[PDB]
Amino acid sequence: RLTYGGYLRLDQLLSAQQPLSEPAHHDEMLFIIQHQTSELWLKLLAHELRAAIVHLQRDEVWQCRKVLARSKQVLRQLTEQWSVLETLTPSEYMGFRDVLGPSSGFQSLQYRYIEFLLGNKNPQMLQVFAYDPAGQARLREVLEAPSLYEEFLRYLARFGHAIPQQYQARDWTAAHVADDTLRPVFERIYENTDRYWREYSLCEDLVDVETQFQLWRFRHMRTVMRVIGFKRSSGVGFLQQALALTFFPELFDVRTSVGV
Amino acid sequence: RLTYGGYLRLDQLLSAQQPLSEPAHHDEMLFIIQHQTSELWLKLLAHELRAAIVHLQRDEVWQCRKVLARSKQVLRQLTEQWSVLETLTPSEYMGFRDVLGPSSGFQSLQYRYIEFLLGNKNPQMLQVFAYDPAGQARLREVLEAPSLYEEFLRYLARFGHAIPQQYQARDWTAAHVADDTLRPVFERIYENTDRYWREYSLCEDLVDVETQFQLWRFRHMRTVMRVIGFKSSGVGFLQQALALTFFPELFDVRTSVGV
Amino acid sequence: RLTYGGYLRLDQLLSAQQPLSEPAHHDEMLFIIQHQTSELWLKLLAHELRAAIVHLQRDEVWQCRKVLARSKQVLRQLTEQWSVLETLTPSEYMGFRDVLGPSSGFQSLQYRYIEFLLGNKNPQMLQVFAYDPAGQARLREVLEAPSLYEEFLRYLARFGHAIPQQYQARDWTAAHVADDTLRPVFERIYENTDRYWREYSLCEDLVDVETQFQLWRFRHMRTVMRVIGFKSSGVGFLQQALALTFFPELFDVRTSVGV
Amino acid sequence: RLTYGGYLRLDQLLSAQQPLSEPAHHDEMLFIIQHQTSELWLKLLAHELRAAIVHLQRDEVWQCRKVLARSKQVLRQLTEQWSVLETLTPSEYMGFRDVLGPSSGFQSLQYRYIEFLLGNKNPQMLQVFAYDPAGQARLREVLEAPSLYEEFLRYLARFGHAIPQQYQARDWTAAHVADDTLRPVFERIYENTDRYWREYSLCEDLVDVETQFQLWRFRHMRTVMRVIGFKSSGVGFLQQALALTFFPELFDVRTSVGV
Ligand code: HEM
Ligand code: HEM
Ligand code: HEM
Ligand code: HEM
């Protein structure tokens, strides 16, 4: 409706916090809200990222950089957000730890969407979303479509850059594989910025998104460490496995031969 | 339930974003989600603040700093958050501005709840939320009850500090009035830190909260200026809100300490 | 040289901290370092800002946003920096306050420089730096040359924008004055972003710079309120500076855009 | 002295920046200023840290937390600051990379002091600082002394906590070794916060210092990846630094508490 609380639908949003602790624990609210605010930022992040792909498809560089600039800010919020949770100590967590289901952020569809959209494709990850065919659908679509990185590659191909013909038609279902034959394409760009400034721009943006995304990944792991700790794989050690993953290897590799 | 989505009620949460732009505008999502995350934090902030009042009533200091510590982290998110909204250019806002009603954050009951709870009480303000009598009642409660700051002077009083006897009971509905007799009480606290380290810790926690709150107030204002411009109420109203103060005595002593 | 400490000349830098408190005060290290770190960023800020103007003179757009982008990060550090100083309680400050002279950051050449570079000129300032003819000379250089904003207006003038002829040559030593005739120029750009995407990006970069600056300005004022106090000049001077603006036209158009 | 630039010694501080690129590369100023500001906070960090150790020795809890609170903010700035250096692309670095020397932060005497101070003791590290007997002597002093953590464990021993007698006296020159007998000491502190609130507070302050320091450690590595890429030593060396832990017992107890 026309009301502030009506437009934002606050009665719906503000009644979604249901602590399931009979006695009612003080620190459960934070646990819930810290999860919901993230889910909200992820939604927006997905909305802006999808626009990054369309803009690239359309050779609209200034538009894409814009949406990417917002994504970074959103991603940064996701990251910065862990600071509040860092206040949840083991003595507090202990109070409502039990009444928690076996669930985990691994079931985060939106998160998965992001991961897929950025290039970390994984077919076997479709079954974990069977309960909801609609969402599984939205996930399969992005899974079959080239990633942000791939659309960025097909973009460079449309403007003289020696992009391996394979990036014209392939099974996008399979996650991108580090392609060494992509190093010279990025050496040219990094050695002639004044000329390839557009591409240059998107490159650093891409590096920004991946980097900021790793910060989130890391801050995420550290928080878990101080809450439930390690125990050394699927768990705290697993979150350490994701840190090794990269969205745009080629981009980082070139850093080792650029200007040699 | 046991679901990740079921425990967080994501279907109910992720279906609250309802863009009213008939043609459907890209940047309108940011408008909504930006408001919603803030509200979710405002709700947590209240949760914590309320406990800050119960611990003070119980003389539970270390427990009180803990919640205020969290409150500060949250208040810091709220402030930092604007950075993402500062990316909403006037060109964009121009595309869904019209569909928006005359309503503004002035209707944020939760916000108003934080305002009163911190001391900035305003009786003739509970009218705007006449629509929701249930929430109105919850608002009138914190209004008629001692503020976070007032329940702090009570704490000082129980431990032998020269706190005016008027604080033991009065019209809580009326905002706090700068008290000159409070100056000597805090000058003492700050000159004998080791002796009054507890009251000295709580004092700075209060100065932090207010400062942070003012940061949010300022950032909010600046974001508005870069979206709808300045040039009465409107963005000018926000300007006045910055002159407000929660714990005047706390800031005043700063100029008398050790003089 | 080629050593770590030798390249960075750490011996010289690391010996620039000289607390003058005879009895020696623990918190005098923070007060000294809080300033020196900021003065180091300011230097970078000036180094990057001077390159922004040059790049703007040569129509080198992407380069300009590149240096400005860094300039925004630096400003963001300078701003977030106040956090560590907010931990300077009146009780601690009170201990080494007396050993400090009447001086103030008002004597910061780098700060004034930046202030001049952005357009906030003020000839009556060169006088406070009469002790340094070499540095003062630097101020005059930026005090007589077109400001960042002005160099941006001339930029627009070379690409067919109704930029008033009075900007091709004038007394740059005089602080810029709001011009209603610039309103239509920025409405066109803001209502046709695709077309004017370059000018559009540069406008938001400037709006970002001024905004981050205000935050730095504001945070500065608040930290002072909590250390010293509210005594126009003094703390009232810090409050007044907030009223200032580097690119008014840029913030005014926000009211008559897309209407 | 009484002058702003006098007291802060701005002529000394602002003349320590000497790029070695003959043609004078625009981006070398950042490279140099990025390090100097760090070394500035590091010097403060150590100052506050050393104050913590003493406080703990005298059983001055609220004083210890205070300095530790400032330490956190310094580390935070030291961590946040990586954003500005992230704006240096491989193209820019390339222009002055060649004239750079083989020196790395591994030569930072101050950083090392911090590392040792927190417990990461390393006898064979004194050698890399032999060129400076005055500084080496400073490191050897904090190397043979109990670290912040060790002094903390000595703190607990003074109040009924079952702390292994070995911490009463031993070779402090050797880095602390994970001890399973400490587990029950922290389980008792976390499962009885109302009783051991002081201990509880110091335990979380310590957990924050190490976490923030790990963040700084991680951003540092990430910024290195985008400047010089990845491809024992170098980048793979920064990856191992994250595997280190200052207070293992504090993190491992997280899995035994409440069970
Ligand atoms: C109380 C704080 C939290 C703790 C202790 C925690 C702990 C964990 C653990 C132990 C895992 C391991 C994966 C598995 O076995 O399923 C995990 C995964 C994950 N968590 Fe968290 N979590 C916390 C908060 C959050 C929040 C607020 C989000 C919001 C999105 C989140 C998102 C995720 C995601 C997406 C994964 C897996 C994705 C991947 O494979 O990279 N977690 N978490
Ligand atoms: C597109 C960005 C935004 C703009 C342009 C904006 C603008 C305004 C304006 C013009 C007012 C003045 C009151 C009136 O005449 O109705 C106002 C008040 C207010 N806004 Fe915002 N707003 C924005 C976002 C937000 C968000 C996300 C929140 C969430 C907390 C918020 C909370 C408030 C509050 C609480 C007040 C009134 C409080 C007081 O009485 O001091 N606003 N806003
Ligand atoms: C202990 C914390 C600080 C306090 C209490 C403080 C206080 C003040 C006060 C009272 C003024 C009024 C102006 C005057 O009469 O000269 C002022 C101005 C100023 N201070 Fe700070 N200051 C602090 C730290 C700093 C630092 C670290 C910088 C670093 C640049 C700084 C820079 C300035 C500048 C540039 C001005 C005046 C410029 C303008 O006119 O806008 N101050 N300060
Ligand atoms: C241009 C950005 C920077 C890059 C690419 C970079 C790169 C590196 C590399 C490759 C190493 C590994 C050791 C070696 O083989 O020499 C290293 C170590 C180190 N760097 Fe940086 N660095 C940068 C900036 C800084 C700054 C500003 C500081 C601040 C003091 C710093 C402090 C250190 C320290 C302390 C170590 C070693 C500590 C340990 O043993 O874990 N670096 N750096």
Side-chain angles (χ1 to χ4, degrees):
Chain A
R1 45 192 282 77
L2 287 302
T3 350
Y4 169 85
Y7 173 66
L8 299 172
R9 296 205 63 70
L10 301 182
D11 282 322
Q12 182 186 166
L13 183 91
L14 265 36
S15 63
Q17 304 84 210
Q18 305 301 171
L20 77 188
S21 279
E22 299 308 74
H25 196 101
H26 176 70
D27 301 289
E28 199 186 330
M29 185 55 82
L30 156 67
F31 183 69
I32 287 176
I33 292 165
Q34 173 86 17
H35 273 88
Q36 301 181 312
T37 52
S38 293
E39 207 66 27
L40 286 189
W41 286 130
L42 285 178
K43 184 162 181 172
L44 217 203
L45 182 56
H47 175 86
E48 303 294 333
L49 254 37
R50 233 147 47 225
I53 287 173
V54 172
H55 288 316
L56 266 171
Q57 295 169 312
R58 296 179 178 164
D59 311 340
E60 293 167 354
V61 181
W62 85 257
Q63 281 90 160
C64 176
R65 302 208 67 230
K66 185 83 200 312
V67 304
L68 292 174
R70 187 171 293 163
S71 296
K72 285 174 204 157
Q73 284 290 47
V74 175
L75 275 167
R76 188 164 68 66
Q77 298 296 294
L78 270 328
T79 311
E80 199 59 50
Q81 209 149 74
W82 297 101
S83 280
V84 56
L85 185 72
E86 284 203 43
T87 62
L88 175 68
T89 67
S91 296
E92 307 173 323
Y93 188 67
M94 169 176 78
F96 61 95
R97 188 215 315 165
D98 287 344
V99 288
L100 258 45
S103 281
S104 84
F106 174 75
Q107 298 184 67
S108 189
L109 208 197
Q110 300 205 104
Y111 178 79
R112 207 74 242 157
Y113 197 73
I114 308 301
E115 202 72 286
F116 273 27
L117 194 147
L118 293 176
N120 192 21
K121 300 294 189 65
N122 185 356
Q124 270 54 54
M125 210 69 84
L126 275 175
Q127 274 303 143
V128 284
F129 297 99
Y131 70 91
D132 177 42
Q136 190 195 231
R138 245 78 52 52
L139 244 193
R140 180 189 300 292
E141 288 168 52
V142 54
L143 178 70
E144 297 161 302
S147 68
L148 218 194
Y149 194 43
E150 290 158 324
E151 283 293 17
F152 170 54
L153 249 36
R154 315 204 309 161
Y155 166 65
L156 298 164
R158 279 188 235 104
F159 295 98
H161 302 291
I163 302 303
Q165 178 262 167
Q166 105 100 316
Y167 298 106
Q168 291 299 153
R170 67 170 291 277
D171 182 46
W172 307 106
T173 267
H176 170 75
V177 176
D179 187 340
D180 300 5
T181 80
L182 231 324
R183 177 181 261 81
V185 170
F186 295 122
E187 301 181 318
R188 190 216 228 178
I189 297 160
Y190 277 90
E191 302 167 319
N192 302 298
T193 52
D194 217 326
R195 155 138 190 53
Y196 303 110
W197 56 283
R198 298 181 174 81
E199 303 97 338
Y200 178 54
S201 289
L202 308 173
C203 271
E204 292 298 288
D205 290 328
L206 289 178
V207 181
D208 301 328
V209 165
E210 155 126 37
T211 299
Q212 183 81 57
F213 199 108
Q214 299 287 192
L215 244 91
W216 178 91
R217 217 112 92 168
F218 187 72
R219 284 270 263 155
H220 170 209
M221 192 238 259
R222 294 309 299 195
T223 298
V224 179
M225 285 183 62
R226 58 184 306 162
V227 166
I228 61 174
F230 219 119
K231 199 52 180 300
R232 81 297 177 180
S233 50
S234 290
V236 49
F238 163 82
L239 293 180
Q240 176 126 51
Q241 198 56 57
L243 289 172
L245 295 189
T246 184
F247 297 114
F248 331 112
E250 344 279 333
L251 251 38
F252 285 87
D253 300 321
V254 79
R255 249 132 267 248
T256 198
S257 68
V258 58
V260 75
Chain B
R1 59 184 276 74
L2 308 316
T3 306
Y4 166 90
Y7 170 62
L8 304 178
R9 305 232 66 66
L10 289 192
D11 296 337
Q12 168 178 168
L13 187 88
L14 278 357
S15 66
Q17 298 80 213
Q18 306 286 158
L20 84 189
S21 293
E22 307 286 55
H25 193 127
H26 177 64
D27 303 296
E28 170 165 31
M29 182 60 77
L30 162 64
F31 185 76
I32 295 168
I33 298 176
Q34 177 83 32
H35 278 68
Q36 308 195 316
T37 59
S38 283
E39 216 73 23
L40 296 182
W41 283 131
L42 287 185
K43 174 175 170 152
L44 211 210
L45 176 60
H47 181 79
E48 300 304 331
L49 250 32
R50 233 135 47 200
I53 295 174
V54 177
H55 295 315
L56 270 188
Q57 294 160 311
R58 297 174 181 182
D59 308 333
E60 303 175 356
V61 185
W62 84 259
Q63 282 112 150
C64 187
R65 310 206 64 204
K66 187 69 178 56
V67 292
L68 291 168
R70 180 174 295 169
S71 289
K72 300 192 208 179
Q73 278 304 72
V74 171
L75 273 173
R76 199 160 83 75
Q77 280 302 306
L78 277 321
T79 309
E80 183 55 48
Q81 232 195 59
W82 294 103
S83 292
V84 52
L85 167 63
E86 297 193 65
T87 78
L88 170 61
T89 69
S91 295
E92 311 171 316
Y93 187 68
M94 177 188 85
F96 63 86
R97 182 208 302 153
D98 296 347
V99 233
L100 280 41
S103 284
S104 70
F106 189 74
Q107 175 182 168
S108 179
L109 197 121
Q110 265 174 181
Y111 177 78
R112 198 94 270 132
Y113 188 81
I114 306 287
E115 205 61 297
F116 292 175
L117 202 162
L118 286 181
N120 194 40
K121 302 289 181 60
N122 188 324
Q124 260 60 58
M125 173 86 90
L126 291 176
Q127 233 306 81
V128 294
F129 311 123
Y131 73 98
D132 178 14
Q136 196 183 201
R138 279 88 61 58
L139 234 179
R140 201 184 310 276
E141 300 188 71
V142 47
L143 169 78
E144 304 189 309
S147 73
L148 181 267
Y149 190 37
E150 292 170 306
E151 275 291 5
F152 173 53
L153 280 39
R154 315 261 272 174
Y155 168 77
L156 295 165
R158 297 178 227 99
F159 289 75
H161 289 281
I163 311 297
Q165 227 279 163
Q166 67 154 304
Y167 297 117
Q168 287 297 141
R170 53 171 291 288
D171 191 3
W172 296 130
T173 330
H176 171 78
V177 180
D179 187 329
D180 283 0
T181 76
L182 247 315
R183 180 170 273 81
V185 162
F186 294 118
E187 288 168 299
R188 184 195 194 190
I189 293 180
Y190 279 86
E191 271 149 30
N192 299 271
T193 55
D194 214 306
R195 165 64 184 70
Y196 301 103
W197 74 274
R198 286 195 172 70
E199 298 95 325
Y200 174 52
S201 308
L202 284 165
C203 280
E204 291 298 286
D205 295 317
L206 297 169
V207 183
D208 288 339
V209 175
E210 161 139 20
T211 306
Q212 183 83 61
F213 203 99
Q214 309 289 179
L215 238 70
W216 182 88
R217 229 124 74 165
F218 187 72
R219 283 264 259 160
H220 166 210
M221 206 246 282
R222 302 292 324 186
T223 312
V224 178
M225 294 179 62
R226 55 176 312 166
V227 183
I228 56 174
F230 206 111
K231 207 253 292 187
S232 63
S233 289
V235 59
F237 178 36
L238 309 178
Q239 199 66 65
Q240 177 70 59
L242 282 179
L244 299 165
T245 185
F246 297 100
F247 332 115
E249 341 297 0
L250 252 52
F251 287 80
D252 294 325
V253 66
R254 239 125 280 246
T255 190
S256 327
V257 54
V259 71
Chain C
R1 64 165 308 83
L2 290 299
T3 322
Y4 174 73
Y7 175 63
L8 303 174
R9 305 226 67 64
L10 288 183
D11 267 344
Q12 175 174 165
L13 189 87
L14 268 22
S15 66
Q17 297 69 245
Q18 311 285 157
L20 77 188
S21 296
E22 298 297 57
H25 194 107
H26 173 72
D27 303 297
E28 213 191 317
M29 193 54 86
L30 154 59
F31 181 81
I32 290 165
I33 289 172
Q34 182 68 35
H35 276 74
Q36 295 181 321
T37 53
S38 302
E39 206 53 79
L40 283 184
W41 287 120
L42 289 176
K43 193 184 181 182
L44 222 191
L45 182 55
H47 179 90
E48 302 306 329
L49 257 40
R50 231 123 35 180
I53 291 165
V54 170
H55 290 305
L56 263 180
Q57 305 182 326
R58 304 172 177 178
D59 301 345
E60 300 170 10
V61 178
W62 81 260
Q63 293 91 146
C64 191
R65 301 197 68 220
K66 179 65 202 282
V67 286
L68 290 173
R70 180 170 298 169
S71 295
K72 298 187 239 184
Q73 285 307 69
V74 176
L75 278 169
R76 190 156 93 72
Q77 284 300 311
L78 268 336
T79 305
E80 202 57 43
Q81 202 162 59
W82 297 100
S83 287
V84 47
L85 178 53
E86 299 209 72
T87 76
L88 170 68
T89 78
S91 302
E92 292 162 342
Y93 183 79
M94 189 186 84
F96 63 91
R97 176 214 300 168
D98 298 346
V99 302
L100 265 40
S103 278
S104 49
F106 182 77
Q107 196 207 109
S108 180
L109 218 195
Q110 311 207 92
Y111 177 81
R112 215 72 259 163
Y113 192 88
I114 303 300
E115 200 76 302
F116 271 31
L117 188 151
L118 299 170
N120 182 13
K121 322 277 188 43
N122 179 356
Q124 281 64 54
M125 208 65 85
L126 308 173
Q127 226 286 60
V128 303
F129 300 115
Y131 60 90
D132 178 33
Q136 168 195 293
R138 221 71 51 66
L139 274 182
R140 190 183 312 298
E141 275 199 60
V142 68
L143 176 66
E144 307 186 308
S147 66
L148 213 205
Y149 198 36
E150 295 164 326
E151 281 291 6
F152 172 61
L153 260 40
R154 311 198 315 166
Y155 163 64
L156 299 178
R158 288 185 258 70
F159 289 86
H161 280 287
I163 306 290
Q165 259 262 185
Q166 91 125 307
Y167 292 124
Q168 299 285 163
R170 60 177 287 279
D171 191 8
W172 304 108
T173 280
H176 183 87
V177 186
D179 190 336
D180 309 356
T181 72
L182 273 307
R183 171 174 255 84
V185 160
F186 295 121
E187 301 176 317
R188 190 192 197 191
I189 296 180
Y190 267 89
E191 302 165 327
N192 297 288
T193 58
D194 207 334
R195 166 61 182 87
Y196 304 117
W197 70 265
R198 284 188 183 69
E199 301 86 337
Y200 175 45
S201 312
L202 284 178
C203 278
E204 288 300 294
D205 288 335
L206 293 178
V207 185
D208 291 340
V209 176
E210 167 151 5
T211 306
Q212 184 75 58
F213 205 100
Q214 300 297 168
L215 273 42
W216 178 88
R217 205 117 77 181
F218 187 78
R219 279 271 246 161
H220 167 214
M221 193 243 288
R222 299 301 315 185
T223 317
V224 181
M225 280 186 55
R226 56 185 311 168
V227 175
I228 301 302
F230 207 127
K231 293 197 288 176
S232 67
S233 290
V235 61
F237 181 46
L238 303 182
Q239 155 72 81
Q240 200 64 77
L242 293 174
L244 291 176
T245 176
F246 293 103
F247 327 117
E249 353 254 352
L250 225 60
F251 285 79
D252 297 325
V253 72
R254 233 127 285 229
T255 201
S256 67
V257 57
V259 48
Chain D
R1 48 174 295 86
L2 292 309
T3 273
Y4 171 89
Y7 174 66
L8 296 177
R9 290 209 65 98
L10 296 192
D11 291 351
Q12 179 180 174
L13 194 87
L14 286 338
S15 68
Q17 297 70 217
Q18 306 289 167
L20 96 133
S21 301
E22 271 311 319
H25 193 112
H26 173 64
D27 297 305
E28 208 189 326
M29 191 47 85
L30 164 60
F31 187 70
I32 287 183
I33 294 175
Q34 187 69 26
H35 291 73
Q36 306 188 319
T37 57
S38 303
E39 216 72 29
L40 277 186
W41 293 116
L42 292 176
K43 180 173 183 169
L44 220 200
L45 181 49
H47 183 80
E48 305 301 334
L49 248 45
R50 227 151 43 205
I53 293 184
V54 172
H55 284 318
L56 273 171
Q57 306 182 327
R58 301 181 181 182
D59 312 318
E60 293 161 334
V61 187
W62 84 258
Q63 291 88 165
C64 182
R65 301 200 64 199
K66 187 85 199 308
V67 294
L68 291 177
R70 184 178 297 148
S71 292
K72 307 181 192 191
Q73 288 298 72
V74 176
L75 278 165
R76 196 153 76 70
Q77 305 309 311
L78 235 28
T79 306
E80 182 62 58
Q81 167 194 169
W82 285 108
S83 284
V84 56
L85 183 61
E86 278 187 49
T87 64
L88 175 81
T89 58
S91 304
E92 316 178 314
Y93 183 66
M94 178 165 70
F96 67 91
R97 170 218 296 169
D98 298 351
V99 291
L100 242 35
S103 289
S104 64
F106 189 65
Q107 183 161 185
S108 188
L109 211 219
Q110 283 180 159
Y111 176 78
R112 207 83 259 144
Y113 201 79
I114 312 293
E115 196 97 294
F116 277 11
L117 194 154
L118 299 183
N120 190 17
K121 301 295 188 70
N122 194 323
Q124 274 57 66
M125 200 72 100
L126 292 172
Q127 241 301 100
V128 300
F129 295 108
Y131 69 100
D132 174 18
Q136 174 188 282
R138 232 91 53 57
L139 275 197
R140 188 181 299 283
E141 176 173 341
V142 67
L143 160 66
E144 300 162 343
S147 79
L148 208 199
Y149 193 27
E150 307 187 286
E151 280 298 22
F152 174 52
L153 269 34
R154 315 244 286 180
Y155 168 63
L156 314 178
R158 287 190 238 87
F159 302 90
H161 293 278
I163 301 299
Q165 226 260 163
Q166 62 171 292
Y167 300 96
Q168 292 299 125
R170 66 176 296 284
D171 196 7
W172 310 108
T173 290
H176 171 70
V177 164
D179 187 335
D180 311 352
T181 68
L182 278 290
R183 187 177 246 65
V185 155
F186 293 122
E187 297 184 300
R188 196 198 192 193
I189 303 174
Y190 282 95
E191 293 161 355
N192 306 295
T193 52
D194 225 302
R195 176 68 188 67
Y196 311 110
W197 58 274
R198 312 181 188 65
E199 297 89 319
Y200 179 45
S201 296
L202 290 168
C203 279
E204 288 297 297
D205 288 338
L206 289 168
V207 172
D208 297 330
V209 166
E210 159 145 26
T211 300
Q212 180 72 63
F213 190 107
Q214 282 296 173
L215 206 58
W216 176 93
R217 211 123 80 162
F218 185 73
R219 289 262 260 151
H220 170 211
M221 191 233 277
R222 293 304 311 189
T223 297
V224 179
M225 299 196 67
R226 53 186 310 162
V227 177
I228 63 171
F230 195 120
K231 173 156 289 293
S232 41
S233 302
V235 61
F237 172 60
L238 303 176
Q239 181 68 56
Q240 227 58 69
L242 300 174
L244 310 162
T245 173
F246 290 117
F247 333 116
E249 348 287 4
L250 244 37
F251 287 83
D252 301 316
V253 78
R254 255 118 261 260
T255 186
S256 347
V257 68
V259 59

